């Protein structure tokens, strides 16, 4: 075995920040008849800030090392959004509108 | 076996911050008849800030090490959102609207 | 076996913060007839701040180590949101609206 | 085994930031009859900032190392969004509109 | 085994930033009858800033190393968005419009 | 004398708003040595919203009316802001700065 | 005297707004040695919105009316901002600066 | 005296707005030694919106009317901003600057 | 006296707006030694929008009317901005600059 | 006296806007030693939009009318901006500059 000698003297580190905000946001979605949302995100992201930092230190003298990092993601989801029929709908998500009319007359 | 000698003298570290805010937010979703939300996120994310920091220290002299990091994610979810029929709906999520009418007349 | 000698002298560390706020929030979701929410998030996230810090120290001289880190996630959820029929609905989630009418007349 | 000697003296590091904001956002999506959203993003992204930082230190003298980094993503999702019929819809998501009319008259 | 000797003296590093904003955003998508969105992005991107930083240090004297980095992505998703029929729709997402009319009269 | 006959029938008025915000605001004014603020605004402004409203009704039949509206503003203020001398000042109102020095050496 | 007959029937008025914001604002004014602010605005402005509204109604039959609207503003203010001398000042209102120095050496 | 007959029937007025924002704003004014601001605006402006509105109604039959609208503004302000001397000043309001120096050496 | 007969029937007025923004703004004015600002605007401007609106109605039968509209503005302001001497100034309001130096050496 | 008969039937007016923005703006004015600004604008401008609108209605039968509209503006302002001497100034308002030097050496 050998030596792994780290020496740190007179270090002044400051102001390290990792910031994540409003990721995968769904806003302002009006529906006159219906809103169907299937919300299945998968998040393995990384937001990292490293200042004056070392990683892992592994002193492993020897022959025959096996190091395996593995990530497997399999997707067979089945999503079905179904609506039969829509009629006679007035939807006013805007502002300051006036005199909006939807008329249906059926004579059999 | 060998030596792993870390020496730290006169270190001044400060201001390390990890901040996460409002991730995966669903806001302002009106529905005139119905709102169907299936909310199944999977979150393995990392928000990290490292300042003047070491990782793991493993002094393991020897032959035949097996190190395995594994992550497996399998998805076979079945989601079904169904609505039969929608009619005669007035939806006003906006502001300051006036005289909005939906009329249906059926004569059999 | 060898030596793992850590020496720390005259260290001044300060201001380490990890902050998480309002993650996976569902706000302002009105429904005129119905609101169906299935809320099943899975959260394995990490928000970490490390300042002047070491990890694990393992002094294990020897041959034949097996180190396995494993995470498995399997999803076969079955979600069914169903509504038969919707009619004659007035939904006003907005502000300051006036004279909003929904009329249905059926003559058999 | 050999030597891995890192010496750091008189280091002044500062102002390291990783920032992620509003990724994968869906905003302002009105639908007169219906809104069907299937939201399944997969996120393995990285936002990283590194200042004066080393990686992993592996002192492993020996013959026969096997290092495998593997990531596998398989997608067989089945998504079906279906609507049968839409008629007699007035949708006004704009502002300051007036005298908007939709009329249907059927005489059998 | 040999020597890997890194010496750092009198280093002043500052102002390292990685910033990602509003990626994969869907905004302002109105639909008079229907909006069908299937949102399945796959993100393995990297936004990185490196200042005065080393990578991994691997001191591994020996014959027979096998280092394999592999990423495999297979896509067999099946997406079907279907609508049967649309008629008698007025959609005004613009502002300041007036006297917009859609009339259908059927006499059998 | 005559008649002043006002008749109002079937009136529907709504949504009248007068809003004033953050007028004459002084923000973020740092001074390394001194801050001298003399704050003497004179405000006779009007923010008015009138909907379906009459003014004054004066039925005054006769000869010789004198109606005088008068506003007089006279300003003879005397403002004196005085500082004798400033030296040897370091002012850092900014963020994330480092190694800022102000040195004065006098040898008589 | 005569008649002043106002008749209003079937009136629908709405959405009248007068808005004033952040007028006469002083922001972000740093001074390394001194900040001298004399703040004497005079405001007689009007922000008005009138919808379906009458003014004053004056029924004054007669000869010899005198109507005088007068506004007089006289300004003889005396403002004196004085500083004697400034020296040896470092001012850093910016962000992320480093190694900023101001040196004065006097040898008599 | 005569007649002033106003008749209003079936009036629909809406969306009247008067908006004033950020008038006479002073922003981002750094001074290395000094900032002297004398802030004396005079504001008699008007922001008006009129929809379906009458003015004043004056029924004044007679001979000899005198109507005088007068506005007088007289300005004899005396403003004196004085500084005696400035020397040895470093001002860095910009961002991300480095190694900025101001040196004065006097040898009598 | 005669008749002034105004008749309004079936009027639909909308969308009247008067907007004023950021008038007389002073931004981004750095000074290395000094900033002297004398800010005395005089504002009698008008921003007006008129839709379907009448003015004043004056029924004044008679001989000898005197109508005088008068506005008088007299300016005898005395403004004196004075600085005696400036020397040895470094001003860096720009971004990303480096190695900027100002040196004065006097040997009497 | 006679008749002034205005009749308005079936009027539809809309979309009247008066907009003023960023008038008389002073931006990005750096000074290495000094910035002297005397800011005295006089504003009597008009921004007007008129749609379907009448002016004043004056029914004044008679002989001897005197109508006087008068505006008088007199300017005798006295502005004096004075600086005695400037020397040894480095001003870098640009971005990304390097190695900028100003040197003065006096040997008496």
From Swiss-Prot, chains A, B, C, D, E, F, G, H, I, J:
Oligomer status and interactors: Interacts with MARK1, MARK2, MARK3 and MARK4. Interacts with PSMC2 through SQSTM1. Interacts with SQSTM1 when polyubiquitinated. Interacts with FKBP4. Binds to CSNK1D. Interacts with SGK1. Interacts with PIN1. Interacts with LRRK2. Interacts with LRP1, leading to endocytosis; this interaction is reduced in the presence of LRPAP1/RAP.
Residues modified as Omega-N-methylarginine: 78
Carbohydrate-modified residues: 9-10, 76, 82, 98
Residues where Phosphoserine is found: 14, 22, 34, 53, 81, 85
Organs and tissues of expression: Expressed in neurons. Isoform PNS-tau is expressed in the peripheral nervous system while the others are expressed in the central nervous system.
Tau/MAP repeats mapped onto the chain: 4-34, 35-65, 66-97
Gene (name only): MAPT
Protein known as: Microtubule-associated protein tau
Comment on protein domains: The tau/MAP repeat binds to tubulin. Type I isoforms contain 3 repeats while type II isoforms contain 4 repeats.
Cross-link (Glycyl lysine isopeptide (Lys-Gly) (interchain with G-Cter in ubiquitin)): 10, 27, 40, 46, 50, 60, 72, 76, 82, 98, 104
Sites marked Not glycated: 3, 19, 23, 27, 40, 46, 50, 60, 69, 72, 99, 104
Domain of life: Eukaryota
Microtubule-binding domain: region residues: 1-97
Outcome of substituting residue 34 to N: In FTD1; minimal parkinsonism; very early age of onset
Disease: In Alzheimer disease, the neuronal cytoskeleton in the brain is progressively disrupted and replaced by tangles of paired helical filaments (PHF) and straight filaments, mainly composed of hyperphosphorylated forms of TAU (PHF-TAU or AD P-TAU). O-GlcNAcylation is greatly reduced in Alzheimer disease brain cerebral cortex leading to an increase in TAU/MAPT phosphorylations.
Organism this protein belongs to: Homo sapiens
Residues with the Deamidated asparagine modification: 8
N6,N6-dimethyllysine, modified sites: 40
Function: Promotes microtubule assembly and stability, and might be involved in the establishment and maintenance of neuronal polarity. The C-terminus binds axonal microtubules while the N-terminus binds neural plasma membrane components, suggesting that tau functions as a linker protein between both. Axonal polarity is predetermined by TAU/MAPT localization (in the neuronal cell) in the domain of the cell body defined by the centrosome. The short isoforms allow plasticity of the cytoskeleton whereas the longer isoforms may preferentially play a role in its stabilization.
Location in or out of the cell: Cytoplasm, Cytosol; Cell membrane; Cytoplasm, Cytoskeleton; Cell projection, Axon
Disulfide bond entries: 20-51
Entry-annotated residues carrying N6-acetyllysine: 10, 19, 27, 40, 46, 50, 60, 72, 76, 98
PTM comment, free text: Phosphorylation at serine and threonine residues in S-P or T-P motifs by proline-directed protein kinases (PDPK1, CDK1, CDK5, GSK3, MAPK) (only 2-3 sites per protein in interphase, seven-fold increase in mitosis, and in the form associated with paired helical filaments (PHF-tau)), and at serine residues in K-X-G-S motifs by MAP/microtubule affinity-regulating kinase (MARK1, MARK2, MARK3 or MARK4), causing detachment from microtubules, and their disassembly. Phosphorylation decreases with age. Polyubiquitinated. Requires functional TRAF6 and may provoke SQSTM1-dependent degradation by the proteasome. PHF-tau can be modified by three different forms of polyubiquitination. 'Lys-48'-linked polyubiquitination is the major form, 'Lys-6'-linked and 'Lys-11'-linked polyubiquitination also occur.
